[PDB]
Amino acid sequence: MTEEVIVIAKWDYTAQQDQELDIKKNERLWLLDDSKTWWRVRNAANRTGYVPSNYVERK
Template sequence: MCSQKRYIQPAKLNQFAKELMKRGVSIVKVVLNFKAKNNRELSVTDGEYLELLDGTKTWFKVRNSIDQVGYCPKMVLRVIERHRSAIARPSIFMGYECG
């Protein structure tokens, strides 16, 4: 069994990720480039933030900043976790899951 780990440093957000945070939706960050192989998949670039729409054990349905929707393999994405500090200022940390 694998335990979930978190980075110590808060993730740096771009404008799209900040908008997603305000909307309260689930967010993932791309950690490896992925090129779509069919019209259901979505090509993504390392460092890109995406809205998480749905997911299975191996694939996540995501939306990018230009409103394109498609599937990416879970292994190229990391779920962004939200945390609240003692002064009620939201912060997020990148996490990863073992699959």
């Protein structure tokens, strides 16, 4: 079973692909995998995708 990581974005980031999800400056995202350069995340909209949101801090 994969472990989920709870983090909060500090700056707005735009998805680099159509399968990824856009985030905001103060938007909380649900990470699924941070081992890869690209991180998989989930949103309150029930959508999930891989976004290398380097502009996010763990909390």
